[PDB]
Amino acid sequence: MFTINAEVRKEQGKGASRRLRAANKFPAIIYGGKEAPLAIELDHDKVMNMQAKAEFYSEVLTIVVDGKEIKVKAQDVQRHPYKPKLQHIDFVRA
Amino acid sequence: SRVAKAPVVVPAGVDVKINGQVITIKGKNGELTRTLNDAVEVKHADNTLTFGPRDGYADGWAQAGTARALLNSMVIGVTEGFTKKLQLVGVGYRAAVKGNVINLSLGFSHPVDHQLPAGITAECPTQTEIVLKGADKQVIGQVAADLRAYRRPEPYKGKGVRYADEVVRTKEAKK
Amino acid sequence: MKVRASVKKLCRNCKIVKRDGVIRVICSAEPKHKQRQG
Amino acid sequence: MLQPKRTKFRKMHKGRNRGLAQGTDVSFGSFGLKAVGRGRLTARQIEAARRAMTRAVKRQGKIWIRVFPDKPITEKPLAVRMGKGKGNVEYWVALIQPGKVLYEMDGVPEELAREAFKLAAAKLPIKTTFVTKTVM
Amino acid sequence: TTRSQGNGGQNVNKVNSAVRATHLPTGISVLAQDSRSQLDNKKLALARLKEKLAEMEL
Amino acid sequence: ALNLQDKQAIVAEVSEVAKGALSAVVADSRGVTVDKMTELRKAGREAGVYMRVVRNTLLRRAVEGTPFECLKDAFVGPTLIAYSMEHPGAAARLFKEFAKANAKFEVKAAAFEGELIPASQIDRLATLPT
Amino acid sequence: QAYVKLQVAAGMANPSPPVGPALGQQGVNIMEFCKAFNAKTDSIEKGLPIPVVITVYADRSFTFVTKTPPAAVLLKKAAGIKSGSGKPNKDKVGKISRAQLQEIAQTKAADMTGADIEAMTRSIEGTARSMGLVV
RNA sequence: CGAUGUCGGCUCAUCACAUCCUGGGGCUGAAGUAGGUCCCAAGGGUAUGGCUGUUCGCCAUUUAAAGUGGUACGCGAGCUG
RNA sequence: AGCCAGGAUGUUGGCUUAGAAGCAGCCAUCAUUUAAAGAAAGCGUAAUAGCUCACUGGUCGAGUCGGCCUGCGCGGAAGA
Ligand SMILES: [Mg+2]
Ligand SMILES: [Mg+2]
Ligand SMILES: [Mg+2]
Ligand SMILES: [Mg+2]
Ligand SMILES: [Mg+2]
Ligand SMILES: [Mg+2]
Ligand SMILES: [Mg+2]
Ligand SMILES: [Mg+2]
Ligand SMILES: [Mg+2]
Ligand SMILES: [Mg+2]
Ligand SMILES: [Mg+2]
Ligand SMILES: [Mg+2]
Ligand SMILES: [Mg+2]
Ligand SMILES: [Mg+2]
Ligand SMILES: [Mg+2]
Ligand SMILES: [Mg+2]
Ligand SMILES: [Mg+2]
Ligand SMILES: [Mg+2]
Ligand SMILES: [Mg+2]
Ligand SMILES: [Mg+2]
Ligand SMILES: [Zn+2]
Numbered sequence: 001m002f003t004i005n006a007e008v009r010k011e012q013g014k015g016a017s018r019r020l021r022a023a024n025k026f027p028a029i030i031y032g033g034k035e036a037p038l039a040i041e042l043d044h045d046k047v048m049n050m051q052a053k054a055e056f057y058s059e060v061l062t063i064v065v066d067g068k069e070i071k072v073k074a075q076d077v078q079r080h081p082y083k084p085k086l087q088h089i090d091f092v093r094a
Numbered sequence: 095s096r097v098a099k100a101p102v103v104v105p106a107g108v109d110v111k112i113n114g115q116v117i118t119i120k121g122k123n124g125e126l127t128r129t130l131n132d133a134v135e136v137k138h139a140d141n142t143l144t145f146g147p148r149d150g151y152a153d154g155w156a157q158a159g160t161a162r163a164l165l166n167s168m169v170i171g172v173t174e175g176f177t178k179k180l181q182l183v184g185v186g187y188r189a190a191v192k193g194n195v196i197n198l199s200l201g202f203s204h205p206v207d208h209q210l211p212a213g214i215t216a217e218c219p220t221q222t223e224i225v226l227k228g229a230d231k232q233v234i235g236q237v238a239a240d241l242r243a244y245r246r247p248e249p250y251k252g253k254g255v256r257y258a259d260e261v262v263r264t265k266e267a268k269k
Numbered sequence: 270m271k272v273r274a275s276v277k278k279l280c281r282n283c284k285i286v287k288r289d290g291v292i293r294v295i296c297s298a299e300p301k302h303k304q305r306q307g
Numbered sequence: 308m309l310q311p312k313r314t315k316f317r318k319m320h321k322g323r324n325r326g327l328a329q330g331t332d333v334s335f336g337s338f339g340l341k342a343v344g345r346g347r348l349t350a351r352q353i354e355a356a357r358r359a360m361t362r363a364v365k366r367q368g369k370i371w372i373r374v375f376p377d378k379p380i381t382e383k384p385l386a387v388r389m390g391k392g393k394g395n396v397e398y399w400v401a402l403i404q405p406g407k408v409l410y411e412m413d414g415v416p417e418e419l420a421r422e423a424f425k426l427a428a429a430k431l432p433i434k435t436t437f438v439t440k441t442v443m
Numbered sequence: 444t445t446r447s448q449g450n451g452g453q454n455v456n457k458v459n460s461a462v463r464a465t466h467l468p469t470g471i472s473v474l475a476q477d478s479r480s481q482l483d484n485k486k487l488a489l490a491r492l493k494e495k496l497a498e499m500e501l
Numbered sequence: 502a503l504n505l506q507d508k509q510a511i512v513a514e515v516s517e518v519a520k521g522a523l524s525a526v527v528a529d530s531r532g533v534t535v536d537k538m539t540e541l542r543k544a545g546r547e548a549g550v551y552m553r554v555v556r557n558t559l560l561r562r563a564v565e566g567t568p569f570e571c572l573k574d575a576f577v578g579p580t581l582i583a584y585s586m587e588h589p590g591a592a593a594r595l596f597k598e599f600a601k602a603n604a605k606f607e608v609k610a611a612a613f614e615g616e617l618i619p620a621s622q623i624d625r626l627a628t629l630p631t
Numbered sequence: 632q633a634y635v636k637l638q639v640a641a642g643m644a645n646p647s648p649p650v651g652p653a654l655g656q657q658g659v660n661i662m663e664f665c666k667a668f669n670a671k672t673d674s675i676e677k678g679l680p681i682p683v684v685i686t687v688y689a690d691r692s693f694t695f696v697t698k699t700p701p702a703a704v705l706l707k708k709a710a711g712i713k714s715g716s717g718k719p720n721k722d723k724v725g726k727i728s729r730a731q732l733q734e735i736a737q738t739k740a741a742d743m744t745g746a747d748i749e750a751m752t753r754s755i756e757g758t759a760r761s762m763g764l765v766v
Numbered sequence: 767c768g769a770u771g772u773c774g775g776c777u778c779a780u781c782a783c784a785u786c787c788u789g790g791g792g793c794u795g796a797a798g799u800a801g802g803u804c805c806c807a808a809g810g811g812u813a814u815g816g817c818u819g820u821u822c823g824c825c826a827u828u829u830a831a832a833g834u835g836g837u838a839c840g841c842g843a844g845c846u847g
Numbered sequence: 848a849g850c851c852a853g854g855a856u857g858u859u860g861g862c863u864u865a866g867a868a869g870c871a872g873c874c875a876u877c878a879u880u881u882a883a884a885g886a887a888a889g890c891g892u893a894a895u896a897g898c899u900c901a902c903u904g905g906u907c908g909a910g911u912c913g914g915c916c917u918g919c920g921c922g923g924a925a926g927a
Binding site for chain 7: 855856857858859860861862866868873874875876877878879880886892893894895896897
């Protein structure tokens with residue numbers, strides 16, 4: 001079971017994306033269902049270690065944002081072309 | 095570190111005198127004085143020597159462990175001394191001692207002689223063995239190294255001066 | 270001494286040691302394993 | 308000797324080589340040799356690395372080459388002036404971008420795979436990495 | 444490799460076009476100054492160096 | 502041998518000491534393969550393989566195991582006193598076997614305490630049922 | 632001390648060719664070993680290897696204790712073959728009986744390190760399997 | 767390009783070290799003799815002739831060795847031609 | 848890590864060779880006393896013999912190990 005702590009993104013775009021990836025975060029977005037897609041930022045270290053297990057991409061994940069829980073499932077992950085880092089993750093609401 | 099944690103006990107009849115980083119140990123064999131690195135904090139607490147860092151000296155535990163070991167061997171040398179046993183090999187290789195100057199003959203065209211330093215003695219129980227006694231471990235090892243250097247033992251017959259404890263590899267002239 | 274730019278352990282006995290700022294491989298067993306970076 | 312059997316055109320521009328790679332993920336086999344560095348691998352280097360890694364795996368498992376050199380590289384003979392047209396195609400390269408998976412492997416232990424990929428990478432102009440197939 | 448030996452011009456007797464090649468394991472020393480380009484000399488007369496070593500071995 | 506195998510090992514030794522009444526002590530400071538194998542062979546010829554030469558009298562494994570029953574063995578942990586358990590028979594005759602082994606070419610480090618199973622002294626008890 | 636078991640079949644007295652100098656590393660005699668071996672084999676059948684332990688002492692009186700005949704040649708007789716196997720898993724050599732393995736092991740049960748002879752019966756089963764005889 | 771005289775020889779050299787000899791050392795598939803290879807070292811020393819304009823080369827006979835390069839492929843307001 | 852111990856039996860596995868006993872090579876590459884012992888990881892012989900390695904116990908008692916990313920840094924690095 002994976003509970004991922006995330007923050008709602010204050011600002012989006014390429015520049016902000018690179019800024020977080022420098023500052024030890026990485027973006028992601030939850031989408032699906034009737035609620036509009038939620039743009040989140042994640043702590044790359046914890047998420048890296050979390051997805052290390054092959055069940056991470058199968059089970060149903062939960063994300064705590066602002067003290068709210070969201071049940072999702074990993075849709076698609078963006079990885080660095082040559083580094084063991086994550087760029088961005090697509091989550092689909094459970 | 096781990097070595098510096100081991101406190102070296104002083105037996106009875108063990109005169110330990112501290113002077114900043116200068117430490118002198120006197121016993122029944124002899125007296126030895128060594129100055130320690132500024133980093134090393136040496137304390138004598140009523141029956142033992144203990145070693146620690148001085149703050150602000152980075153390589154403190156490494157220097158501390160070295161100093162601990164040196165003082166340990168100082169204790170050993172002053173109390174029961176150090177022995178180095180060298181053994182010759184080969185035909186005619188022989189050793190004699192004239193007081194404090196070893197007459198080695200090793201198949202050279204000249205007779206070899208080593209002058210000992212002050213703190214050492216030597217003796218030759220047999221023709222080719224030499225047991226040499228001393229206090230300072232570094233110096234006694236140095237003198238054994240010198241007598242061995244006079245003819246380092248070859249690896250083809252072990253021939254030449256070798257440490258008695260030494261085990262020498264022997265190669266074979268493949269044809 | 271093998272003067273290499275790429276010093277390694279060659280057996281189970283070879284030991285890497287830095288001396289005076291030079292990497293070396295001293296083999297307690299095999300003399301041919303004695304390497305020096307340079 | 309990977310080399311196009313036929314090609315539409317016989318010589319090509321120098322071109323540029325910027326950007327990151329596409330064949331980035333270990334897709335066919337289980338283990339992969341991913342290029343950190345940006346360069347060009349002549350078919351010679353590709354074949355040397357392939358031979359080395361196959362010999363390391365003792366002809367067990369299967370080996371995927373995810374780069375095929377299709378760009379012809381031209382050189383003038385020695386001691387010829389600069390004009391007089393483009394030089395002759397002397398070999399073929401596969402432009403690499405950082406992250407291109409040069410090779411892939413399966414049927415071997417991960418340990419033998421790492422060892423074979425290292426014996427192969429020691430033949431390449433560009434610095435590489437060992438990566439594994441990952442679920443999603 | 445060195446200057447062309449023989450009889451030519453000052454270019455011939457000044458520029459290093461002869462590439463004389465010796466097969467040390469046998470000592471067969473033969474190579475040309477014929478082509479004005481050093482690599483052409485090297486390869487073209489390497490052909491006949493292989494020829495001379497073939498004759499000797501044979 | 503992590504926590505799991507440690508738990509099966511402690512289970513095995515607890516079950517052995519609960520099933521058996523009598524035991525003997527040993528300490529192989531100079532215990533030869535001959536002595537160890539002859540004792541184990543004696544166990545095998547007397548009865549099944551249940552009797553062992555296991556050497557596990559640690560300060561934190563057997564001492565933690567003993568509180569179950571026969572708590573008198575907790576003090577025995579120091580000075581490396583290993584046990585050899587005996588399930589069947591009332592006061593089996595194999596106690597003197599370790600004394601004979603100590604007599605025949607041993608450094609006499611076992612001290613043959615006997616762990617006072619009948620609450621006797623540490624001296625040898627030559628009286629056994631016959 | 633200095634006990635190494637190196638012998639041949641009982642049929643050949645004075646095994647000078649095969650072992651020779653190995654048995655005579657020291658200046659010890661070669662006739663004493665042969666006479667002791669013959670004296671021991673007078674009570675058994677001839678033609679079988681017999682392992683013996685050797686303790687040479689400085690009083691010039693070597694002490695020797697014999698063992699059972701080797702299980703290799705014992706199973707050789709049991710199977711009735713002269714060549715064991717080469718490269719076994721490909722083509723099978725012969726079939727072996729559990730009861731006959733037990734009978735083979737029961738005679739050396741006395742000398743062996745085993746209470747339930749079934750254990751070393753299985754061990755010789757594995758021995759013949761590793762040689763190339765499937766039980 | 768209102769001139770920077772090219773090959774080679776002679777005389778004179780000076781520097782580099784990727785050392786030919788001598789010097790110190792490690793491994794050797796180094797028994798010794800003699801080698802192989804690598805490392806430190808530029809203090810000194812480092813052929814004479816036959817042929818050829820030759821540098822080079824081949825050959826003859828020496829030598830501890832007959833080093834590889836820079837210097838306007840050193841040196842014609844120094845010589846030769 | 849080191850100090851104290853061991854590291855057995857089948858078996859000397861069958862071969863081809865001149866002999867192969869783990870060490871020349873190949874296939875089999877199991878099981879047995881089990882704390883634990885690979886038909887063998889190394890050194891040795893003419894072949895053994897012989898010294899070792901893996902793995903088990905014993906002593907002292909707080910850290911140990913080897914991967915990843917990275918900052919700075921070391922060698923590789925010889926010319927007039
Ligand atoms: Mg921008
Ligand atoms: Mg170099
Ligand atoms: Mg463009
Ligand atoms: Mg592209
Ligand atoms: Mg020119
Ligand atoms: Mg001009
Ligand atoms: Mg002018
Ligand atoms: Mg130099
Ligand atoms: Mg040299
Ligand atoms: Mg000079
Ligand atoms: Mg100078
Ligand atoms: Mg000078
Ligand atoms: Mg004339
Ligand atoms: Mg030039
Ligand atoms: Mg000039
Ligand atoms: Mg010059
Ligand atoms: Mg001139
Ligand atoms: Mg003229
Ligand atoms: Mg340990
Ligand atoms: Mg650098
Ligand atoms: Zn080594």
